[PDB]
Structures are given as C-alpha cells and as structure tokens.
Design a protein around this ligand. Structure first.
Ligand SMILES: N=[N+]=N[C@@H]1[C@H](O)[C@@H](COP(=O)(O)O)O[C@H]1n1ccc(=O)[nH]c1=O
Ligand SMILES: N=[N+]=N[C@@H]1[C@H](O)[C@@H](COP(=O)(O)O)O[C@H]1n1ccc(=O)[nH]c1=O
Ligand SMILES: N=[N+]=N[C@@H]1[C@H](O)[C@@H](COP(=O)(O)O)O[C@H]1n1ccc(=O)[nH]c1=O
Ligand SMILES: N=[N+]=N[C@@H]1[C@H](O)[C@@H](COP(=O)(O)O)O[C@H]1n1ccc(=O)[nH]c1=O
Ligand SMILES: [Mg+2]
Ligand SMILES: [Mg+2]
Ligand SMILES: [Mg+2]
Ligand SMILES: [Mg+2]
Lengths: 207, 211, 211, 207
C-alpha cells in the first residue's frame, strides 16, 4: 500500500519545492516516490466558462474549479496499488489535453495543491497532511514573476486577478484547511529542520 | 493655542497618506473651521554623496534604512511646529537624489499630521506626537499597491523593484518599523477603508480641540 | 432591543479579560444603566476521550488548536444570544478535562462580550460580532504573565509549561490567531493599560446604544 | 591585523551561539579565532552598588554597568596585534576575580554583548557588525531557564527583574544599535543561510 501525503498552502508558498526536498532527503540514507499536483485536475471548461476565463471573469481558486470526482477516483486507485493515468492541463489554454501520464505504483505519493485538504473524502485518504506557510508578499512576488514567465501575461491583469480571486479564495477556502494538517511548515522549503523531522517520520512509518 | 501633532506610521503602501487625507476630510466636514497640514517623512531624505549615488545606480543603496533620513532635521522641524513656529521643509528630487534650492513654507495649524514608515523609530520624535496611529495593512495588498506605484516610472524594471522590495523594503519593515508598533495609541487594520476606526479617531481629535 | 455582541481576541495573557472588564467598568461609570455580560471561549472546550486524556497526561495534546473547542456549540450559543434568547453555557473541569453536570444560565444583556484567542477564527462566529477588538500585547510581556498564571497550579512544572508554550501555544498563536487580526475593527496595543483606545471604544458603544 | 567582528542582540537571542557557528563553519574549508563576551567586562561594584544588586535594585543592562574604558583599551590593543589579559567576572557574586585569561593574537576576533555597539569608539573598532534578532518570548523562555540553572535564582525574581530592567533597557539602549549592524540575522543561529553568507564574506576579506 502506498503511503500518500497531502500537501497544501497558498499560491507560491513552496508546496512543490517542499515535496521535492522530501524526495531528495528520502533517497539519501530505494523507496520510490512520485509527486502529483492538483493543478493537473482542473475541470473541463464549457465554451461559456472558457469565454469568462479569457475575459478574466473565472475563479480558478474556487473548489468547484477542480475535478474533485476525478481526484477522488485517481487517488482511490493509487491507494489500492493500481496504475493510473493522469490528465495534463494547459493553464494558458484552459484545456485538458488528450495525452495522459502513466503513474506506476510507488511507496510514497505526494499530492500537492492549494485545496488538497478541502474535500473531506480526499482529505481522509492522506495518511499525512502538511501545510506550507509563507509570507503573503513573499508569495505574491513569486506569484507575479512566475505568472509573467509561465504564461506571458500582463502585470495589471495579474494583480487584478490576484485581488479579485486568489487572495479572497485563499482566506475563504484554503486557509481554513490549515487546521487539518499534521505538520505546519513556516518559511516553506527553507525550514530544513521541519522537513528533516517529516522525512524521518516517513522513514520510520515505512520500517 | 498650540498645534496638535499626530504621528502616523505603517508599512509601505499601508494607507498612511490616505488615512491622513480621510482624517482631514472628516475634520472639515464635521466642523461647526480647523486648519490642518500633512507632512511626510519622504521629504526628509538625506542628500547622497556621489559614492552613495553610485551604489544607488547599482541598486545597492538601502533607502528604507534609518540612516537614509535626516532625523536631526526631522526632530528640529517637528520641535518647532509644536512650539507654533513656522518651518521650511526641503524638496527632494529623487532622480537627482538631492535637495532642490527651493524649500516649502509650512505654517502652524490646529492639527499637524506626520506620516512615515519610520515615524516612531526615534524616541525623541516619537514623544513629540500627542497621538500616534499605526496603519496595519497587509504584505500582499501593500506589495501590489507598491509595485503599481513604483512601476509608473519609465526606467523602473519590474524585477528591479520586486528585488529591492525583497532585499531592502520587506526586511527594513520587520527590523525597524514593526518594533515601534506598540507605541501607537491606536492600530488601524485595513487602512483608510476602516471608517469605524477613523471616525473614532477624528471624534477623539475634535474633543481635544474643544477642551 | 437586541443585544450588542462584541468579540475580543488576542494572544494568551494579552489582556482580553481585563479589556472587557475595563469596558464594563467604564460603561457603568459613564451611564446617565446598561446590563452587560462577559463570555469566555475557555468555557467551550471539548470533552476529551480517554485516549486524548492519555496524550494530555503525556503533555501531547494541543489545547490551543481549533479542534480543541466546541465551535458548533460556540456558534449555536452566540447565535441565540444575538436573537435575545437565554442560553446555558457549560462548566469545564480542567483536571477532569470534562464538562460538569451543572450549566450556567446566561441571560441576554445590552452588551455581550466574548473573549478568546480564537474568537475570530471561524467566519460564521466572526460575523455575529457587531464590533471586533484585538488586544495586541507582546510575547515576552504575555509569556511572563502566562507563566505565573499557569504556575499557580500545584503540579505544573516550570519546564513543562515553558515547553508546552514553545510547542503548542506560540505556534498556534501564529498559525490560527494572528491571521484573524485583519478582521478586527480596532487593534489595541498594550491591552488594558491603553485607556486612550478603550475610552474611544466605550464611547463608540454608548453612541450605538443611544441610536 | 586581527579582523574583529562585533555581535549584539537582546538577551538570549543567540549571540554566543552565532559566533560559535561562525567559527565552526570557518574552520572547515587554519585561521585562528577567539570569542570575547561583553559580560566579562562588568564594572567593579562598590559596597553600596553591591548591596543594591543583592536587593535586586541594580540595572545590569544599562551601558554604565560595563567597564567601557577597559573594553575600549582591551579591544584597542587586540587590533594592534598585542596579547591581552581578560578579566573574569562572577554574575552570582558581582565581583571581578583576580585571575585573568590570556588571549593571544588571532586572525578573527568575535566580540559578543548586548551593548557591543552602544559606545561609538568601541563601535568603530569592528570591521563588521552583526545583530542577532529573535522573538521576545523565545528569548525570555531561554532567559528564564538559563537564569534558573546558571544562578539558582527564584522565578518571581527573574520575571520581576526582566520587566523592571532587562526589557526597558533593551528597548532604550540595545535595540537602537540595530541600525549600526552590517548584517541582521533573524532566527539567530537557526539562520544558517545568513551565517553562511557571513562566513564566506569573512573568508574573502582575509584572502
Ligand atoms: N488565475 N488564477 N489563479 C490560480 C491559482 O492561484 C493557481 C494555483 O496555485 P499554485 O499553482 O501556486 O499552487 O492556479 C492559478 N492559475 C493561474 C493562471 C491560469 O491561467 N490558470 C490558473 O489556474
Ligand atoms: N526603493 N525603495 N524604497 C523606498 C521607500 O520604502 C519608499 C518610502 O515611501 P513609501 O511609504 O511609498 O514606501 O520610497 C522608496 N524610494 C526611496 C528612494 C528613491 O529614490 N525611490 C524610492 O522609490
Ligand atoms: N496548555 N495550554 N494551553 C491553554 C490555552 O492556550 C489557554 C487558553 O487561555 P489563555 O487566554 O489564558 O491562554 O488555556 C490553556 N490550558 C488549556 C487546557 C488545560 O487543561 N490547561 C490549560 O492551561
Ligand atoms: N540582571 N540582569 N540582567 C542581565 C542581562 O540581561 C545579561 C546580559 O545579557 P546576555 O548574557 O543574554 O547577552 O546579564 C544579566 N545578568 C543576570 C544575572 C546577574 O546576576 N547578572 C547579570 O548581569
Ligand atoms: Mg503547483
Ligand atoms: Mg505615503
Ligand atoms: Mg482570559
Ligand atoms: Mg553571553
């Protein structure tokens, strides 16, 4: 049975880097590990919803924006040792592509996303839940640079979409889930002492 | 017969200037008038040596550090305003990073509002304030306003000010501004949009002015 | 004809109970009277399972965590007080970590003050408050008061509560209480010794009660 | 010429551990290093001042409580390559003992104390100035445990001496000196990234 860990936190808090660090420190001193991200499981937009998204009028930080049924199904079979296929989604296009990614059974499975703990059925599947905590302006400055490079978008649009959707959804949806975490990590990936404790806690659950 | 000096502080783009503006508008609207003037710490920068202007061109000068401001001039100016004297304040050209020859004459008023990220840093200036307010707005709300404010300049690269913020502005806020927070009489969450708190401050000022 | 509900929060030993006491004393002293009652979040702890009481004996139970409190009961009780109903609040025995059979009858009042480190955590409870205050006292002032408060118990080892503070209380304050700070109408530095801020709060309450 | 570094910060902020870390990370990848502490240079108390100290009525966090002339003299000769003798002071007794400690010339000299940057003449002797920054309650909890073990004193006395003398003197005397530091270290000795930058900055000033 795979030991799967939920990881959450606000945007640009360092969730994906925290898991990458967990793998790198797990490999030294072979348990096989795979990292899935909730951003892969965005919903299939209709043409109306797609038009709203191009007008900047769609909330992609709302729980309903994620294919929670597919997340629950994909995670369910992973816990049952099966091989799963994982969608690939294009943030620029807001489309789920036809190609998928094969994920073979592993010993540890990190699932990363801003709302990984929102759904109770999904939440109870994680044997361990981590919440990454980072200063808001630090996250925003990472968010702004990331969104300029990763999608070539305008600065006035990033800041207006942040204030309209990202920040309110963080406070209404993501931040309340912090109470479900087993370990809260301040300073994100820079908290190597916290990560070390987590890594050794994983290693001795597997022994 | 003596001016009522009010100190306002808080992080960059927390709403220090707006909160003072709102106070001024609410003072005159609820009058019966009272003369009130607004000063800003950003007028009292030190004139840089060409050695320091060189570091500034390389982006290696901390403008958010206490050493960047003429505190001797800040204290002297505020000490004279409290005593009812008329002061001359300098005008700083930021491209040149120097003081122009012109000054600005600031006459005494019933209320004198001084705003600055480091308004409460020095104990001598902090004690001149008969009321001290702290605007508590939030890093990501403040940063987003700070960026669009700073990007209105022609040569300001985005990654330049995003890096000067992380290197200088955010640390200096936590190292020098936040410790002064305790000294405030009142801490205003969410800045100028907090009319509940600002209404109570304005009505507290009116009571002091009316004996 | 409906009770005015006021939420007070802040860290441990910040002065939440004193600030409410000062407000109550100042309300009656400046009257003409108004009935006002004080509730505390520490009455609404969950009753522990003997599995959890075991972890508590080992010092491995987080009493500063949101899960440690009966928020369903907190919201239901406060919802009924706002509607003018009369509520029964439980009495918690902390040695036993259980609710006694006795309740306490709390009648509606003109002003209802609810104090708690996590008073503003849940949005549904936070919205019941027509006024929200945050006491901002300081870690070392608060810790020193917290220790002498907690050491008045016979079996409380010093290094036990100094370790439960570092492990549970200080993190929970930063993880769950501080984010709610923005929602307050007014943030009071230095707690109950800040009579400037408390006087403006009390006079703001009087105005609401007088139409 | 020795390269001497001033280190300051509030009580129990980790000043002495920060320098110890600096030495340990300097030795690996031999430059010889010695750590002096300002607590060694407390003044010679008269019998009146000593009586006040036993009654808990003496401010040991005030700049006048330190033999600033001896500090300036001792540091002056160290910069001039000479060998110096260093007093030893007993906090329990409030006495300067007759024995001294010989300090032979070194390549780097760390000087640690809560008011190391207060005196301007002393301050200008440091080629590098560090300020250690730590949460107040974290420092106090370290202060309380340290003062119970190190001097066997009563808890009510520690907390009353802290509120009366230590905390006010920190805000009036020590904290303003933070503006003189070249590097401010948040989280104290846990900020290994900040320390690393300092260590490499020292190594390349010596090369
Ligand atoms: N728009 N928007 N908000 C989003 C949310 O912050 C992020 C998920 O957060 P994180 O990847 O940092 O864990 O997906 C973001 N996002 C951004 C651009 C886009 O085109 N689509 C999209 O989903
Ligand atoms: N760079 N930088 N930091 C600065 C400081 O934080 C700010 C003070 O004003 P506020 O309250 O808007 O942040 O002015 C900024 N500043 C200073 C000098 C300069 O030449 N240009 C400039 O933008
Ligand atoms: N331990 N611990 N943390 C507690 C929490 O922070 C505090 C809440 O009240 P305040 O505002 O005084 O901190 O009660 C403390 N608490 C809780 C349960 C218990 O059995 N004993 C106890 O002291
Ligand atoms: N009393 N008192 N305050 C002191 C100050 O906090 C400390 C210097 O701080 P730090 O050692 O943490 O750098 O010396 C302390 N101190 C304590 C006990 C004593 O008997 N003598 C003494 O000087
Ligand atoms: Mg991601
Ligand atoms: Mg301004
Ligand atoms: Mg209380
Ligand atoms: Mg020491």
């Amino acid at each position: 049975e795979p030991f799967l860990i939920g990881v959450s936190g606000g945007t640009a808090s360092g969730k994906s880097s925290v898991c990458a660090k967990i793998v790198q420190l797990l490999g030294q001193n072979q348990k096989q590990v795979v990292i899935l991200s909730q951003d892969s499981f965005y919903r299939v937009l209709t043409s109306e919803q797609k038009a709203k998204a191009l007008k900047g009028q769609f909330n992609f930080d709302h729980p309903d924006a994620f294919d929670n049924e597919l997340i629950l199904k994909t995670l369910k079979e992973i816990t049952e040792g099966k091989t799963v296929q994982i969608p690939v989604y294009d943030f620029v296009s807001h489309s789920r592509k036809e190609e998928t990614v094969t994920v073979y059974p592993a010993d540890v499975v990190l699932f990363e996303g801003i709302l990984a703990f929102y759904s109770q059925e999904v939440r109870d599947l994680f044997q361990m839940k981590l919440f990454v905590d980072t200063d808001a302006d630090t996250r925003l400055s990472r968010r702004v640079l990331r969104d300029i490079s990763e999608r070539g978008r305008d600065l006035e649009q990033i800041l207006s979409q942040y204030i309209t959707f990202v920040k309110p959804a963080f406070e209404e949806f993501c931040l309340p889930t912090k109470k479900y975490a087993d370990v809260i990590i301040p300073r994100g990936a820079d908290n190597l002492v916290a990560i070390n404790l987590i890594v050794q806690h994983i290693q001795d659950i597997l022994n």
